[PDB]
């Protein structure tokens, strides 16, 4: 699978530009989207989503109104039209693929991203910003939310991702315990309504970077801030 | 004394 | 009330289910056929007539119509564990050829072989489009050899027409029920249009009857 | 010679039910009246899976007891979500003429076979997000009674050439092929520690195959008539057995005869399904009076009816929780009871 | 006081018509909620039949509609009590918003019902293509908006009016189109079009052309069952026939009030518009009880279920 | 020819096994019935606030 985007550059501020995310590899138009951006220093925010068959968007509050999100199925293609561009809307810009039924693992395939550069929420609590890790040794990741994230159905919707330096995040434990497709069994996650521990056994190399959890339980999809691990 | 049923 | 994973299952669920629809309504406006009959008996020249390993279908479609034709003679097995998927087959298309009368009583087993299918509990109501196949060979067959062999205590004449016309009398005498159904018999040609013109001319009856009891009339 | 074998043959079959009544000192009745009745068992339909547009002819759960596939004849299958009702997937097949279907126990695979001779199987986790077909599966000249997996990579058919099978689906070809039914099979049944099986077909013999070896061990007849259905008790050690006669016979397998019968003077048609409960104590036969039966399986009462459907009960599966019983029918109704 | 508006009808008159309109109400009731039972039961129709299914279903929803509704409030207050209208001013426009908007549903109902015979017979290739549950659907619901639109100009017209011989008078409370005449005509003669003008005559060229198909397809039948297809152009004329008998004479009544202006009305005419109203409405309800019975019971496939 | 043998080999093999008695397996079903019975959500019903259904 492959999603590339296109549309970056230098842009003045207040003006409009148009985000192209072409997708290869698989079934489109099965998959509901998503756009998530990240301050070219600061961890990920979420920005946009549709549904399959285009039948339900949402936005967030910060986008709504100067942001519409569009999806061309025949040609695999993702758009974004963005317009009135502030400050603020200086990001790294990703397409996230997503796909919803009873078992699957959303936000599994993160693009390569794009940069582009201008000139009652549910608060989710990194414990700590920056910690020092031995090669070898066990490593504990907490999270905390504002909101019991235990719905009545027996789910608790907390994700984790990782980012490495200079590649698209990838998803590692979705639904606060089950195992991403194609990821090593030494990380753990575990926990309970609103507290939440992310479990690394034996670190090695090649898997330091940024953690971020991340709530689904409703919309908008507010991430964590990001712990970041450090030799 | 037209009716006034209708 | 659904979380915002749930909400999305459910938009699966439905957007399958219009899938769902749009498929079924596809098929079911569609003309489907079964063809029944014993080996070396013109089935194999009525597919080729209308185009020109267990289950065999020859898709074509006529006035902007499509049908299907299922060729179930290929696979054998027990035809009472699998003839109930075949209930809404719109006509059965039945094939016997005419110069397996004294042939080994191929015609005897043909005979068999119709009534188990006319009268089934299944094809109650579903027609029957009888085909004669390979007319000129029995012309030839009974101008040589007597007919008193297929059938014992037939005694008329060898002509052919005569001959033609009670094997025709003799098949379309097995249906315990004509009330329901009803029999559309042909004696094929060479190689002739007029064939898959019988075909359709037959469904088109049988499409036109059923729409009439559909619709209160009939 | 070959006369002589046939006496031969005669002879053996004499010492075999001579064995075997032999070994019967007291039938199930004896044993089995000091048990104090189930009571009458009533259950509603909790649930109505309304997706199918033709009749469906099979059904199976998931070992996870929550999704069930369901195959039908207007081309789909249809994984639901038994609780939500929701469609998980909904896959096209390749010939709409579909016998079986089967759910692996992993969850990872399916399979369907018909009038195809295919037991073709697809692979539910993919990447590309869409289900596709793994392999297809065949040299089996007939049409498929039954497919159900062993593990993920061993599925065992049943066909109508009388022969069952075992492929191993990543090479594709059929390892152990199992001669020696005479009228074609159309039941097949694993046992819960998969080391043998037993199938059903028009003999009215149900044999007790064996996995590895490759033999049959051991014949059981005494059904007047074909057989439809075969399910294994819990414990391993015995299974009844459905069939057109309107009679349910459960078998012994250490004992090597018939034990119980299951009939009653006003049904007189055929069985399509049957399945245990989980405890053993009720079996669920599926009939083409248009309604499922109830059968105290110790005491051969008739416990409760359930008339949900308006055609025949083609299949029917009891959860592997115990929880649930999914009974599909030629109505394209899956109605889940409890 | 105000007694003018007293109506003189025969007593007997009265209780007679109150036994054909309580022998209609049971009737057509029982009828049509055994057709919707009956096709609500019976589900196993998977194919083109489903359409006709969907046509005749509404068809006997919509004389339910008419029977239900308009049935018990007309007996009371147009049969017994002339004076006073008992249910006031929206009461008066709501009752004959649901009259005429139930009365447009049921002339659509079996317009459209013969549009799509005469597809499913006369084109059955062209009607198998058309064919989808989607699209009856949506015709459906078009034909009630529609019935639901064309009975909106009775609603203001239809309001409640004081006529006694004082200015105000507590009994002298009438029912009575209360908009100047000559739009009151407009009114009456596009009702008189859009419910009997237009469905006459597509029920009797599409019925005319389907029992010419049929009877071409005996006379080819004969000359290469018969009954049931002779019984089927039975049904088609009687169709036609029990639609003029029982919806002619409403509408002239209708009319009569139209165009029949107060110079020209008598005290004989008073009271034969009474007795005449009496009987042109039970004329409606006999079509509103006779359309299930020869739309359903005559075709020997429903006898069984029914 | 050789089938009938085939016949006879496989009814020989069949022959030769140790069965045990009928009330033995009659108590052995019994005993599992007896064993499983309380967890078997049919036999008897359970509380709605348990049932997923």
């Known amino acids: 699978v492959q999603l590339v985007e296109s549309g970056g550059g230098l842009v003045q501020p207040g003006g409009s530009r148009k985000l192209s995310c072409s997708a290869s590899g698989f079934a489109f138009s099965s998959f509901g989207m998503h756009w998530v951006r990240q301050a070219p220093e600061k961890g990920l925010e979420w920005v946009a989503y549709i549904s399959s068959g285009s039948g339900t968007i949402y936005y967030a509050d910060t986008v709504k109104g100067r942001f519409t999100i569009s999806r061309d199925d025949p040609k695999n293609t993702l758009f974004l039209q963005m317009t009135s561009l502030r400050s603020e809307d200086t990001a790294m810009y990703y397409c996230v693929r997503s796909i919803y039924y009873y078992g699957s693992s959303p936000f599994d395939f993160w693009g390569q991203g794009t940069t582009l550069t201008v000139s009652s929420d549910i608060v989710m609590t990194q414990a700590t910003s920056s910690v020092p890790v031995t090669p070898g040794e066990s490593v504990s990741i907490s999270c905390r939310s504002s909101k019991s994230l235990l719905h009545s159905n027996g789910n608790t919707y907390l994700y984790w991702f990782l980012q490495r330096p200079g590649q698209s995040p990838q998803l590692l434990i979705y639904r606060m315990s089950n195992l991403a497709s194609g990821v090593p069994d030494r990380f753990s996650g575990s926990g309970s309504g609103t507290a939440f521990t992310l479990t690394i056994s034996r670190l090695e190399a090649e898997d330091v970077g940024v953690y971020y959890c991340m709530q689904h339980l409703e919309y908008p999809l507010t991430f964590g801030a990001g712990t970041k691990l450090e030799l | 004394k037209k009716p006034y049923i209708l | 009330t659904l979380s915002a994973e749930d909400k999305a299952a459910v938009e699966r669920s439905k957007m399958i289910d219009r899938n769902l629809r749009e498929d079924g309504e596809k098929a079911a406006r569609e003309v489907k056929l079964l063809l029944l009959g014993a080996g070396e008996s013109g089935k194999s020249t009525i597919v080729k007539q209308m185009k020109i390993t267990g289950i065999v279908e020859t898709h074509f479609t006529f006035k902007d119509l499509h049908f299907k034709m299922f060729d179930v003679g290929g696979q054998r097995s027990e035809r009472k564990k699998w003839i109930h998927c075949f209930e809404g087959v719109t006509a059965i298309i039945f094939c016997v050829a005419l110069s397996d009368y004294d042939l080994v009583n191929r015609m005897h087993e043909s005979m068999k072989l119709f009534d188990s299918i006319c009268n089934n509990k299944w094809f109650t109501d579903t027609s029957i489009i009888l085909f004669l196949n390979k007319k000129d060979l029995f012309e030839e067959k009974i101008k040589k050899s007597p007919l008193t062999i297929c059938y014992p205590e037939y005694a008329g004449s060898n002509t052919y027409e005569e001959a033609a016309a009670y094997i025709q009398c003799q098949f379309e005498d097995l249906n315990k029920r004509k009330d329901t159904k009803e029999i559309y018999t042909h004696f094929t040609c060479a190689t002739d249009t007029k064939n898959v013109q019988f075909v359709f001319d037959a469904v088109t009856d049988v499409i036109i009857k059923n729409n009439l009891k559909d619709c209160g009339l009939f | 010679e070959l006369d002589q074998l046939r006496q031969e043959a005669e002879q053996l079959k004499n010492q075999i039910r001579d064995a075997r009544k032999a070994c019967a000192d007291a039938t199930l009745s004896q044993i089995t009246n000091n048990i104090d009745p189930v009571g009458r068992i009533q259950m509603r339909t909790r649930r109505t899976l309304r997706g199918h547009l033709a009749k469906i002819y099979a059904m199976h759960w998931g070992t996870d007891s929550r999704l069930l596939v369901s195959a039908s004849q207007d081309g789909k299958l249809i994984i639901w979500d038994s609780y939500t009702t929701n469609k998980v997937h909904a896959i096209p097949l390749r010939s709409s003429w579909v016998m079986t279907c089967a759910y692996a126990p992993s969850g990872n695979y399916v399979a369907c076979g018909g009038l195809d001779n295919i037991c073709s199987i697809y692979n539910l986790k993919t990447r590309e997000g869409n289900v596709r077909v793994s392999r297809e599966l065949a040299g089996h000249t007939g049409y498929l009674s039954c497919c159900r997996f062993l593990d993920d990579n061993q599925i065992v058919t049943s066909s109508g050439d009388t022969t069952c099978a075992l492929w191993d689906i990543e090479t594709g070809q059929q390892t152990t092929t199992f001669t020696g039914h005479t009228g074609d099979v159309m039941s097949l049944s694993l046992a819960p520690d998969t080391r043998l099986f037993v199938s059903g077909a028009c003999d009215a013999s149900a044999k007790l195959w064996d996995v590895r070896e490759g033999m049959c061990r051991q014949t059981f007849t005494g059904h007047e008539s074909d057989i439809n259905a075969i399910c294994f008790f819990p414990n391993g050690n015995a299974f009844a057995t459905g069939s057109d006669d309107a009679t349910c016979r459960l078998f012994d397998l250490r004992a090597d005869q018939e034990l119980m019968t299951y009939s009653h003077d006003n049904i007189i048609c055929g069985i399509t399904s049957v399945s245990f409960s989980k405890s053993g104590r009720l079996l669920l036969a599926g009939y083409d009076d248009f309604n499922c039966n109830v059968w105290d399986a110790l005491k051969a009462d008739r416990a409760g009816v359930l008339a949900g459907h308006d055609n025949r009960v083609s299949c029917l599966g009891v959860t592997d929780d115990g929880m649930a019983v999914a009974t599909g029918s030629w109505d394209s109704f899956l109605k889940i009871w409890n | ?306 | 020819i050789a089938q009938a043998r085939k016949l006879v080999e496989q009814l020989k093999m069949e022959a030769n096994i140790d069965r045990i008695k009928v009330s033995k397996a009659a108590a052995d079903l019994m005993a599992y019935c007896e064993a499983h019975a309380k967890e078997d959500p049919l036999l008897t019903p359970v509380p709605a606030s348990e049932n997923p259904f």
């Not at chain 5, 036994?19 to 019976?42: C, E, H, I, P």
């Not at chain 5, 147009?78 to 006031?88: C, L, R, S």
Request: hydrophobic content about 50%; some cysteine; proline content about 3%.
């Open chain 5, 1 to 306: 006081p105000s007694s003018e508006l007293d109506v003189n009808t025969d007593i007997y008159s009265k209780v007679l018509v109150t036994a054909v309109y309580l022998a209609l109400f049971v009737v057509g009731t029982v009828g049509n909620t055994v057709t919707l039972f009956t096709l609500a039961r019976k589900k196993s129709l998977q194919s083109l039949q489903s359409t006709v299914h969907y046509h005749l279903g509404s068809l006997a929803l919509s004389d339910l509609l008419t029977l239900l509704l308009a049935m018990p409030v007309e007996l009371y207050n147009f049969i017994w009590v002339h004076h006073p209208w008992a249910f006031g001013d929206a009461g008066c426009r709501g009752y004959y918003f649901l009259r005429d908007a139930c009365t447009y549903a049921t002339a659509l109902n079996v317009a459209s019902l013969s549009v799509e015979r005469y597809l499913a017979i006369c084109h059955p290739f062209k009607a198998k293509t058309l064919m989808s549950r989607s699209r009856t659907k949506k015709f459906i619901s078009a034909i009630w908006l529609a019935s639901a639109l064309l009975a909106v100009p009775m609603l203001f017209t239809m309001g409640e009016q004081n006529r006694s011989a004082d200015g105000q008078h507590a009994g002298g409370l009438v029912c009575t189109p209360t908009i100047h005449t000559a739009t009151v005509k407009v009114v009456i003669q596009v009702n008189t079009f859009m419910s009997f003008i237009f469905p006459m005559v597509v029920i009797s060229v599409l019925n005319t052309i389907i029992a010419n198909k049929l009877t071409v397809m005996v006379r080819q039948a004969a000359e290469q069952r018969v009954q049931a297809l002779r019984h089927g152009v039975r049904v088609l004329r009687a169709v036609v026939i029990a639609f003029v008998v029982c919806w002619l004479p409403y509408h002239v009544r209708r009319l009569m009030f139209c165009y029949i202006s107060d110079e020209q009305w008598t005290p004989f005419l008073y009271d034969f518009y009474h007795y005449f109203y009496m009987v042109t409405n039970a004329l409606f309800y006999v079509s509103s009880t006779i359309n299930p019975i020869l739309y359903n019971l005559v075709s020997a496939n429903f006898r069984h279920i029914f």
